[PDB]
Every structure is written in structure tokens, then in C-alpha cells.
Design a binder for this molecule. Structure first.
Ligand code: ANP
Ligand code: MG
Lengths: 432, 584, 445
């Protein structure tokens, strides 16, 4: 309590002395000479000294007169049922200046590992209302499904549409949406806020906002916070949660930043090296547990470098995350909204989520025949790539009407259009 | 106060013992000469210090003195129309005080003319409740910019006595009974550079900036409060792009930061800006322009200090309600400074040697810019438009600087060496250069112009994109393998880039091209193309369809500074209609 | 005056001295060897009573116990006097011309100081190089920073010598000087330069410093700084229009790479140090004109794009720093034209300040725009014809392509020892430009 033995300040780090009972990854708060107060977290503890990182920074600290207090608990998020309708910062602190929230209980944000046998497989699909997602790589409750896109491809716009139109057919209780904004600009953040207010989803949603201005170490916590709140709603309160996290790329950038700040030797391709485990720890907090009502679904939005050479490796996560959804600007150029390249997108859990009793079962057969129509329809128009002098010009025009029609209509249904699955099926029938 | 003894000197790193009372990131006078420096890390009672002046000749045993304050800029009357050192030392006073034409070490210069007498007319009334940002009176620093004096942060209370009169920057002009004690304030306030000036609310930028430059305003526009990047190889026109938009932008104030760049460029600006006048109010551009010079020879730590000082001044004039446009010349120079400082500290290297926090530093900068609601009761709206120039590697732009830059900005003007090589001096590359504001700008433009202009710009860009395909097709035959419409479409794209796109060659008339003229120019071009095509369909053949008026290209140069553009530009429309039908 | 006999370590070319005080960073030192030889070094890092110095010549043969070090009290200084002209120096301000030592008027730090931006005067007037492409298309201005980029090959070196002898201000000025710095050149490279200077009678007009490959690496750093210090001094104290020419700055920055490697500095791009740009800048931004003074320093640094002309860190950083470029292409070198100058890549940004009526003839600016366009399009037609016959050329491209051939064949290749005045270049350009139909050109006779 209120130790006053700061012996070093280097960069954003500090060294404290004559402290005992200090655990690793333990939150501290610093009392400066000017009465300012800052939060930091223990990152290394020796026999008597300990070493911490300050979130806000070390500018303005006088070591002789500053003081440190060890809280005695790691990073926590207070959980309450009153979260809905609310906006929080990176560390789950109110950002809308609303009523004070009394936490039901304070939860460690790292979470726990579901026992493999305990986990329950996902068998029921979720109607996105997007023909280019529902029919084919369909999304099931509890699935880990990510959308890959480049900046300015409308990836954020698609994410908004999914949030607005997400629902399930049983609908005994309504859906719940947890949205995390990770290291994104104000303009980007504002887009989502405006959509939710306008559409009224704020009353039905909970969100955590972390902008680029905010410190990198708050980005790490931001995902953990959103998933911990999602788990609280999902399992303790039985809700059905859709978790949407926007640009885990910058979470990964922050991961590298923190690793360099902690003087950790880089891993593969200059990244920390525990990225595989860190991402998998995040992404695997999904699915349904047997014996519990609620469920957790994740649609992480990820900015994708055009090159495969560097950033948060698509296949580093892609095989972690049970399928993926691809957006491309080449697509986007010709009024194709939401630009979903359907060639390389898959939902790993599509087969089981698709059947009579959960879907109208034209759908599995019709999806497979339209999957053949994807391949053959591509053959018909997509594969030409300005070639096909003779190919598709020999009364394959059925083909050479199919796929261009499909690419325009089906992929660009309009960002504010909601297609009931049966309809999507029907427009597939029309295209048949 | 306590004196620190230098115990180590390695390059720009200075370590000094007995510095217990100092705090982190405090400016300090280091050495006998007292060169300026900053405390970046403290271990026990010793302090590692980063200096902003050449330490050649500094040794151990010399004294070190702290100023007990972080890096800050003097914010008061006198700022406008002045050129400053990266740490806000005014260069003109510097020259006179030192009686030398070079930059020496250890000079102590107040940033603002404290001795000059200003006429302050008070606007607040005694008894008024005041808060941070509330404006009490205004000094007419220029006939254009009224220097609005406002209550600093951390001060709230009731005014006691305030009266208009002649005061200097140091004389107290007003006093407030605050919560505890009495606070008397001057027309000047200090502000720490690194931390952004607080605001009440941030807003979306949806007001296009009139660059004057045709390609920018028509195709890749930047809104008031937005951010733009100019990546380009050497010899491309990025420096002069910042110059042109600093000259002609419809923005109340302009802040120019030239870190790590040639000194002739800054000298050129201070000579030509007073010579350039603006007829809207009859006075030079320097009455509104501010300059901060940190050349390549000047020390590297000052290169970061320069961009931060620049934006702190911009945020100051933004809290007054004005719009500001700040442009940093070759932010790479800033990043390259930060890289060697990371290497000398033996930090864990990030990408390409840059520190891991590069993307964070960059993100903090551009997000300080924007259209905001300033602090105070009136809740006035101010904006900062950020222009960043990036010079990287060879032509290759895929390096941490531009990539992190484009992650946080919505406007990309990409210059390529080939276009500048062909003396397409406005070398903004089309089809890559993109403005994410373009769709919002279209709505604004249509309402302001009460005409369908958005469809015109989509048609222009679609024609240009079409031409890219026809270049690959043209390999077979130059003019006999293509189609008739394709040949005409080629001639239209040629006209777009050779007339609309190409901008000034330092020609007065070809430099600005008002928005009204931009409309008429693009309309005459577009009408010619679509008339010639649709009229070509009815048995009109291209062999002599290209005929008569080619002077349209030439025509766009003239009639700018006077309103002679309406007659001259629409007469081209009617004339081309007549001649199209006559050709039949 | 103190000699220190306590040397704690010697590591390669670096040694550390214990139990010393009053030292300063970047100070020079002198070592008393056990055999009495003297080696010069400079301090690199100081802390407490320990000093870290690096010997220029090397540490081979140094007994630590029986050897001592002297601290000179000053950093690298060049003694200056107005008798520099006519005497040839090496990279360390020492005499290489079998000449008597100069009585230095004063001693100057070679690093100098930055020119204050307001105090600086913008580049202007015109310097006559004798080069048609340089004087006409890519005009040179006093205080401008124009470099020469070439392939590894003979063109650069010949052009350096030619520029040195011919380059004179248009007669108006009272006096003129040239400062020659020579970096990483073989003995024969050096002797060629020196013999041409003695033979052309320009040695008396000019001061030159010679540094060779055998000489230590750190000396190459010193050499440009020396040359620019003396150039500054002449222009800004003795009011002369100094003109500095530097040889293969690649050799200079390869010295920088070698030095940094010895000091275990982290690499940058292509192994070159991180501070390449600024270091190059510190030299190149000492040119220009100062307000309230007459006389100016103009820099024409020379360099080869090493290996394949990729424009790799040496040239790219230089291009960022200078105000233009003149580049040589080996394709033109293979052909008869000498100097081989591809006009299109080459550029002078400040041309217009030094051109126009009065300073030159009134047509100078209008001619270059037309000749440039005609060249680009004659070459356009030239390559266009290739693999498509001359049918595509038709009438108009045919005359145009031959224009390009004629342009390179006589306008550009001056010959390496033949001077051209600006007027005869312009008039020749006219005769060359007369082949073209009077309808095409951009302005009236
Ligand atoms: N309208 C124009 N737009 C762009 N460049 C132009 C224009 N008119 C002329 N230029 C040429 O542009 C060059 C100056 O461009 P500039 O931006 O200063 O180079 P730069 O890329 O900034 N070099 P640096 O900033 O040091 O990396 C000169 O050679 C001018 O001739
Ligand atoms: Mg520039």
C-alpha cells in the first residue's frame, strides 16, 4: 500500500523497490507529485523489486516524490446486466457519460479454457440476410467466422449490415450484439455509432471503443473485455451473442508494440511469436457449451494486406477460424456491394447448419447445385479474364448470362437490403 | 536550484548525475554553453538527456540545469507571420540578437515579441461566468485574423475587472475570482507540445477544401478537417503541392512545417508570400501564414519537435473558431529521426528498423487534426486539415511510413516518377490516388452548384480508366485495330489529362482555376466527348471528325483572375455544338 | 599541455584511456608511440574519467604501457588563409603539392554551422559551364545543388574535368574560384585531374584537395568537410563565387559504411548507415547565397549509380537532397555521343531563376520547352518504329525521329575539350530546331 520507492523510469516502464506480495500481471496505480493518477500493470517481479508499464506514459513523473500503490488484482471487467445500450472505452469504462453502473461482479478478463468434451457442436444457422453469405458459406450460431478485406472496400459497411440484420428464426428471445472497435480512427468509429443510433440497435447492443489515439496496451485489453462481457451475457445470462471485432490487424500491431516495449525477442516475421496462441486464445472463445442456453458467435473483421508478405497473416488466423469471407477492391470497383468474392470464401460449418427443420431444405441441394453453378458460372464468365474468344461463345450463353448476372445481382444485393434465406434461394432459382 | 553534473557524452545522448528533482521530459540547459535538451529516461539520481543542438565539444564534468517544464510553445499575439525554430525560437530575432547569419548553440530566445504593444478590445462583461476556451476579448493581429483571446484551461470562475487598452504580452489584462485564490491572466498561454489541446466534441469532416488544383478538387478531394498524404519519389511535385495548397486554399490559417528539407525552399516561401497578395482583402498571404523551419543540417531531435510544435499552433488557432491547414514536408524525415533515436537507445527494433511505436506516433498526429467543437459556451466550430508529404526508399512506397500513414487517412495523392518524367508536373497518379471523401464531396458540390456534378466526375474517371485498357490493346495497331468510338474515347481521355489534369508551370493564370471555372472546364470537355460520340453514330466519320477547335486546351488557361470565364467558357460549348452539326 | 600514459584497452582501431579529465566529445588526440611515431585520432565517446578514441591510421604495433595520448583541446580544424589558391592539399588540409606551409589566418571547425534560413538568399544568376545540355535545358544557378549521376564508367570523370576548367560565370563578376574535392580515386584518377588543372592554367584559379583509396576511411569523411569549409570561407568572407566539385560520393558513403561497421552501428538500407541522408545533407546544404553578402558557394557533386543503375540508397538520398540532377546513361556512352546525357531524367529546378532576358538571351526559356517536347516525341517515334517498320512513322514521325538522332548527335555531344558559349548553344539549337515545321513550335520568332 502506497509504496514510494520508484528507483527507475525508462521509456514507458518503471522499476519499483522494496515491494513484496506483488504478483505478475497485477494492476498498480501511480500517484505523481502533482496528484495526477495513472494506471499501470506489473510485467516482471524479482525478489524485492518489480517492474511495471504505465498506460498513459511516463511524461511528467518525478521519481523522488511520486508514489506507487499495488491494487492486488489483475485487469478485471465489472459485469452487470445493465451493460446493454451502453458504450465503453478500451478498458470498459463508461464513455457516453451515462448512469453509474454498479457491477454485479468483477471478472478477470483472460477467461477460461472450455473442456473439450464440455463444448457442444453448433447445428443451427443464423440468417444474416445476405444472399452472398447465407446460401453458401452459411453462418451458424457459435461459429468463428471472419471477414477479410482491404481498406476502403466497404468491410466496415458490411459489418454494419450484418449487425443490423443478424437474427435467428427460433427467436424465443432476441439476439444480442457485442461490438469492439480496435485501434480505429474517429471517422471509422463514428460510422458504427451513427448506424446503431439511427437503426436503434444501441438499445439492443453493448459496445467497447478503442481508437488509435488510445494507448496500444489498451488495445490488448479491448478484445478481452468484449469477449468477457459476451461470455457473461451468453452463459450466465443465457443470451445469444454475436461478437464483432473491427480490425484485429491493429490488435496485432499493438501486440508487436508491447512485445518490443517489454524487450521480448521477436518471433517469426518480426512478430511476437506467441501470435498463433494469442489469436487462438481470442478466437476459440466461441461456440456453445452443452448444458447451457447461451451461445457466442464471432465475426472478426480483418484488414488484409494485398500482399501476403507481412501483416497479421491471413493463414495464421484462417486455419484457426473455421472458414473466412473475402472482400476485394477489384471486385468493389464495379458497384458490387457488399463486394464478396465468393470463389475462395468458405464456412467450415456450413454442411451441418444446413438442413430441413433448421432451413427450408431446398437449400442444401440448391446450394450445392448453385455451388456447381459458382464453378460452372465462373467458367462461363469469371474464368475468361478477357480471353474466351471461343469459350462461352458457343451457346454457353446460358452460362454467359448466369455468372455476370450472379456477380452483379447476387453479390451486390445492396448494403441496406435484407434477404430472407428463402428469397436468396429464390433468386438462386431465378438464376438456375 | 540543484545542479547536475555531466557524467557521459555519447552522440546526442548526455547523462548527468545529481538530477533527483528533475522530472521526465523536462527541458534543460545542458553543458557550459547551455544547449537545449530534454530528459527522456531517469535511472536513480542520474538522467539520460536528449539534446536538440549539436553536442560537438560537450564533455563530462560540465553542469546541467533543468527548467522544470516540458517542451511548450508560447501562444499569444505575435505568432502569425513569423518563422520559428523547431523549438519556436524566432529566426529573425535570432539573427539580430546573435549578430550572425548562422545558427549558434545555447541561444535563449522568447518565442513571442513580449515588448510590442497591442490594442486589446474586451468583449466579455464583468460578472460573466467563464470556462476553458471562453473568449473575453480580441486583438486585431491582422486585418484578416482577429487574434481571439480566450480563457486557458484549468481556470474557472468569475471575472472581476476587465478593460480594453494597450497591453503587452506580459501585462495582465483580466482577473478571475477562481474556486481558490485570484488568477490574473495575460494575452499569452503556454501549452505542452506533445499533448493535444482539449476539445468538447469531435465531428465529421464534410466540407470540401478548395485546393484550386483541378485534379485534387475534381477527382480526389480533401474535406476541411480531413487528412491527405503525398507519397512520391524525388523530382515529383510533392513539395510544390504543399506550396500550392498553402497559397490558394480557402482556409483562414496556414501552418507550414518543413522538417529535414532544403532551406532554400523555406527562404523562397518567406520571400514570395509577402509579394503574393490576395485581392479578397488586399493583403499578403503571410498575414495568415506561419512557418516552422527545421532543415536537414539542423539537429534531428528538433525534427520531431518541429511537427509537434506546428500542430500545437494549429490547434490553438482552431480553438478560436478558424479553419487551419497544416502541412508537414516529408514526414519521413521525422520517422528517420525517430529510427536512429530508437537505435541509439537500443530499443527492440520494429519493422525496417523503425521503432515499434511508429504506427502509434503517426496515429496520434493525424487524429489531432479534424473538424471539432472547441471548448467554451458558444461551442464554435474549428478545423485542421492535415497534409503530410512522404518521401521513401526509391519509388517504392510500401514501407512503414506510408503504410501506417494510409491506415489513418482517407486521402491518397500518389505521385509516380513516370508521370513527372513526361513533364506531367502535377504528377498525381490517377487510378491509384483515391479520396475516401469523394462520395460526400459529390453531395456537397451538387447542392452548392445546383447542378449534377457528381455524375460528371464519375464519367471523367470512367473514361480515364477505360483508356488504361486501350493502351494495352493499342499494341497491335496504333489507330486501325481499335474501334471508331474507342479512337474518339482515346482523344477524349487525352483531352482530359492534357487540359483539365495538367496544372500550373508556375503560370499565374494556370495556377488556381476557381471552382466555378472547374465546373465549366469539365463540362465543355464532357459535352464535346458525348456530342461527338452520339453524333458520330449517325454516319459521321472520325477521319475528319477531329477538326476545327483544338484551342479548347489553350482556352482553359486564361480568364482566371478576372471574371471573364463565363462568356469565354460557355461560348466554347455553343461553338462546338454548331461545328459538330456542320461537319455532319 | 598534458600527456596521458594510461591506456586501458585497445580494440581494433579503437582504444580507451583511463584516469583522464577535462576531455570533450569529438576532440582530437595525438598518440606518442613506444617507438616515437605519432598517430592522430579523435575522441568518440567520453564518460567520467574514461575516454574512447579511434585512431585514423590504425593501432597496429602499439605497446600500451610505453605509449601515451595527448589531448589537443580542439576538434577537426582547417586553417584558412587567402593563399589557398595554387597550393594542392590532401584530405586532411596537409600539402600534397611540394609547397611551403601556409600561415593560417585562422582555424575553422570543418563542420561549420547551418546557414540561417532568413539570412539565406535564394539562388540566382547563371554560371556558364560550356555544356549545351547543362546550360540550355538544365540551367545552373549560383548556390544551386546540381549533381552528376552516371553508370560506373568513364563519362563522369571526363565530365568532372571538363566542368572544372570551362565553368565560368558570365563576365560581369570581379572574380571566380573553384574548389575540387576528390574521393576514393585511384592514384591515376587523381593524377589525371591534377595534370589537366596544371595544363589548362586553371590551377591558379582554384583550390583542390586530393584523397585516395589507400588513405584511411575516416579521412574521406574529413575531406568534403574541409573542402566545403574553405569554399564557405572564400565566398562568405572574401566575396568570391566559389564552385565546389566532389568526386564519387559513393566512395564517401562506402567510407561511412566501413566506419559505422567498425563502430557496430545498426545498418539501414543495403547495409548503409541509418543517418546516410542527414550526413549527406550536412555537406550539400552548405551551398547557396547569404543575404547582405556577395560571393556564393555552388556544389556539383559527382556520383555513379553503383552496379546496375537501380538508384539505390547513395543516388536516391542524393536526389532527395539536391535541387536537380544530370545523369549519364551507358547506352549513350556506347554511342559516339560524349558527354552521354539523357536530358529527360536530368533536371534543374531553379533554372528559371537563372534564365531569361538580361541574365541570358530572352529566348533561352522558350527554346528548352520546345526542344524537350520534340526530343521526347522523336524518341517516342524512334522506339515506336522499332518492330513496326517506318510505316507508322509516316511523314510527321519520320522528321521527328530524325530530329532526335540529330539532337543527340551534335547538340548534346560537345566533345570533351570544346567550350560552348550560351549564345552559340542557343543559336545551334535554333539551327537544329529549324528542321521542324514552324507550325509545331510553341512561340514566335
Ligand atoms: N505544377 C507542378 N506540380 C508539380 N511539380 C511541378 C510543377 N511545375 C513544375 N514542377 C516541377 O516539380 C519539381 C519540384 O518538385 P518538388 O516537390 O520540389 O520535388 P520533391 O519531390 O519535393 N523533392 P523532395 O521533397 O526533397 O523529396 C521541379 O523540378 C519543377 O520543375
Ligand atoms: Mg522537397
Amino acid at each position: 500500500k502506497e509504496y514510494r520507492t520508484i528507483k527507475e523510469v525508462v521509456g514507458p516502464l518503471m522499476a519499483v523497490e522494496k515491494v513484496s506480495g506483488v504478483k505478475y500481471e497485477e494492476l498498480i496505480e501511480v500517484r505523481m507529485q502533482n496528484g495526477e493518477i495513472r494506471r499501470g500493470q506489473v510485467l516482471e517481479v524479482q525478489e524485492d523489486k518489480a517492474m511495471v508499464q504505465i498506460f498513459e506514459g511516463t511524461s511528467g513523473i518525478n521519481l523522488k516524490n511520486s508514489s506507487v500503490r499495488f491494487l492486488g488484482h489483475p485487469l478485471q471487467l465489472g459485469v452487470s446486466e445493465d451493460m446493454i445500450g451502453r458504450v465503453f472505452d478500451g478498458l470498459g469504462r463508461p464513455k457516453d457519460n451515462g448512469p453509474e453502473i454498479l457491477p454485479e461482479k468483477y471478472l478477470d478478463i483472460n477467461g477460461e479454457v472450455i473442456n473439450p468434451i464440455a463444448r457442444d457442436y453448433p447445428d443451427e444457422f443464423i440468417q444474416t440476410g445476405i444472399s452472398a453469405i447465407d446460401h453458401l458459406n452459411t453462418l451458424v450460431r457459435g461459429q468463428k467466422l471472419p471477414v477479410f478485406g482491404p481498406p476502403g472496400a466497404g468491410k466496415s459497411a458490411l459489418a454494419a449490415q450484418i449487425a443490423r440484420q443478424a437474427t435467428v428464426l427460433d427467436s424465443s428471445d432476441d439476439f444480442a450484439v457485442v461490438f469492439a472497435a480496435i485501434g480505429i480512427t474517429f471517422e471509422e468509429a463514428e460510422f458504427f455509432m451513427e448506424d446503431f443510433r439511427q437503426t436503434g440497435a444501441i438499445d439492443r447492443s453493448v459496445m467497447f471503443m478503442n481508437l488509435a489515439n488510445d494507448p496500444a496496451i489498451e488495445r490488448i485489453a479491448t478484445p478481452r473485455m468484449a469477449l468477457t462481457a459476451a461470455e457473461y451475457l451468453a452463459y450466465e445470462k443465457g443470451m445469444h451473442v454475436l461478437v464483432i471485432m473491427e480490425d484485429m490487424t491493429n490488435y496485432a500491431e499493438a501486440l508487436r508494440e508491447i512485445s518490443a516495449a517489454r524487450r521480448e525477442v521477436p518471433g517469426r516475421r518480426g512478430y511476437p511469436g506467441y501470435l498463433y496462441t494469442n489469436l487462438a486464445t481470442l478466437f476459440e472463445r466461441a461456440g456453445r457449451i452443452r448444458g447451457l442456453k447461451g451461445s457466442v458467435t464471432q465475426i472478426p473483421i480483418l484488414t488484409m494486406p494485398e500482399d501476403d508478405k507481412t501483416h497479421p497473416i491471413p493463414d495464421l488466423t484462417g486455419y484457426i477460424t473455421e472458414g473466412q469471407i473475402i472482400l476485394t477492391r477489384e471486385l468493389y470497383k464495379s458497384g458490387i456491394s457488399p463486394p464478396i468474392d465468393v470463389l475462395p470464401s468458405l464456412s467450415r460449418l456450413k454442411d451441418k447448419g444446413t438442413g430441413a427443420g433448421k432451413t427450408r431444405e431446398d437449400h442444401a441441394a440448391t446450394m450445392n447445385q448453385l455451388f456447381a453453378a459458382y464453378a460452372q458460372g465462373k467458367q462461363a464468365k469469371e474464368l475468361a479474364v478477357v480471353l474466351g474468344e471461343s469459350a462461352l461463345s458457343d451457346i454457353d450463353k446460358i452460362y454467359a448470362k448466369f455468372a455476370e448476372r450472379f456477380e452483379n445481382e447476387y453479390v451486390n444485393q445492396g448494403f441496406y437490403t435484407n434477404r430472407t434465406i428463402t428469397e436468396t434461394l429464390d433468386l438462386g432459382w431465378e438464376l438456375l | 536550484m540543484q545542479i547536475g553534473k555531466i557524467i557521459k557524452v555519447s552522440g546526442p545522448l548526455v547523462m548527468a548525475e545529481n538530477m533527483s528533482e528533475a522530472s521526465i521530459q523536462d527541458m534543460c540547459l545542458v553543458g557550459d554553453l547551455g544547449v537545449i535538451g530534454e530528459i527522456i529516461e531517469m535511472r536513480q539520481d542520474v538522467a539520460s538527456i536528449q539534446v536538440y543542438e549539436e553536442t560537438s565539444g560537450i564533455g563530462p564534468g560540465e553542469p546541467v540545469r533543468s527548467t522544470g517544464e516540458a517542451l511548450s510553445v508560447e501562444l499569444g499575439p505575435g505568432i502569425i507571420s513569423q518563422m520559428f525554430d523547431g523549438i519556436q525560437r524566432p529566426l529573425d530575432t535570432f539573427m539580430e540578437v546573435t549578430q550572425s547569419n548562422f545558427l549558434g548553440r545555447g541561444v535563449q530566445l522568447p518565442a513571442l515579441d513580449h515588448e510590442k504593444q497591442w490594442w486589446f478590445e474586451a468583449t466579455i462583461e464583468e460578472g460573466t461566468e467563464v470556462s476553458a476556451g471562453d473568449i473575453i476579448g480580441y486583438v486585431d493581429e491582422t486585418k484578416i485574423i482577429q487574434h481571439k483571446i480566450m480563457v486557458p484551461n484549468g481556470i474557472k470562475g468569475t471575472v472581476q475587472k476587465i478593460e480594453s487598452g494597450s497591453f503587452t504580452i506580459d501585462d495582465p489584462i483580466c482577473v478571475i475570482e477562481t474556486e481558490q485564490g485570484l488568477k490574473e491572466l495575460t494575452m499569452m498561454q503556454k501549452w505542452p507540445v506533445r499533448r493535444g489541446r482539449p476539445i468538447k466534441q469531435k465531428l465529421n469532416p464534410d466540407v470540401p477544401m478548395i485546393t484550386g488544383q483541378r485534379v485534387i478538387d475534381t477527382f480526389f478531394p480533401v474535406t476541411k478537417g480531413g487528412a491527405a498524404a503525398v507519397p512520391g519519389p524525388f523530382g515529383a511535385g510533392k513539395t510544390v503541392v504543399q506550396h500550392q495548397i498553402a497559397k490558394w486554399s480557402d482556409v483562414d490559417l496556414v501552418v507550414y512545417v518543413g522538417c529535414g528539407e532544403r532551406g532554400n525552399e523555406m527562404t523562397d516561401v518567406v520571400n514570395e508570400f509577402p509579394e503574393l497578395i490576395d485581392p479578397n482583402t488586399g493583403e499578403s498571404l503571410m498575414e495568415r501564414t506561419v512557418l516552422i523551419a527545421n532543415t536537414s543540417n539542423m539537429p534531428v531531435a528538433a525534427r520531431e519537435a518541429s511537427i509537434y510544435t506546428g500542430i500545437t499552433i494549429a490547434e490553438y488557432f482552431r480553438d478560436m473558431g478558424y479553419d487551419v491547414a497544416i502541412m508537414a514536408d516529408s514526414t519521413s524525415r521525422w520517422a528517420e529521426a525517430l529510427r536512429e533515436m530508437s537505435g541509439r537507445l537500443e530499443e527492440m527494433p520494429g519493422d525496417e528498423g523503425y521503432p515499434a511505436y511508429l504506427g502509434s506516433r503517426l496515429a496520434e498526429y493525424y487524429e489531432r487534426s479534424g473538424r471539432v467543437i472547441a471548448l467554451g459556451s458558444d461551442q464554435r466550430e474549428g478545423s485542421i486539415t492535415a497534409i503530410s508529404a512522404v518521401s521513401p526508399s526509391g519509388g517504392d512506397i510500401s514501407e512503414p511510413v506510408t503504410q501506417n500513414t494510409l491506415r489513418v487517412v482517407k486521402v491518397f495523392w500518389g505521385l509516380d516518377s513516370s508521370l513527372a518524367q513526361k513533364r506531367h508536373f502535377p504528377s498525381i497518379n490517377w487510378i491509384q490516388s483515391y479520396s475516401l471523401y469523394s462520395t460526400e464531396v459529390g453531395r456537397y458540390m451538387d447542392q452548392i452548384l445546383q447542378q449534377d456534378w457528381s455524375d460528371m466526375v464519375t464519367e471523367g474517371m470512367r473514361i480515364l480508366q477505360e483508356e488504361e485498357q486501350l493502351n494495352e490493346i493499342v499494341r497491335l495497331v496504333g489507330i486501325d485495330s481499335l474501334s471508331d468510338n474507342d479512337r474518339l474515347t482515346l482523344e477524349v481521355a487525352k483531352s482530359i489529362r492534357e487540359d483539365y489534369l495538367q496544372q500550373n508551370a508556375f503560370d499565374d493564370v494556370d495556377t488556381f482555376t476557381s471552382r466555378e471555372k472547374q465546373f465549366n472546364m469539365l463540362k465543355v470537355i464532357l459535352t464535346f466527348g458525348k456530342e461527338a460520340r452520339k453524333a458520330l453514330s449517325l454516319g459521321a466519320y472520325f477521319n475528319e471528325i477531329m477538326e476545327g477547335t483544338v484551342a479548347v486546351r489553350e482556352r482553359i488557361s486564361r480568364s482566371k483572375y478576372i471574371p471573364e470565364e463565363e462568356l469565354a467558357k460557355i461560348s466554347s460549348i455553343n461553338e462546338e455544338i454548331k461545328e459538330t452539326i456542320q461537319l455532319i
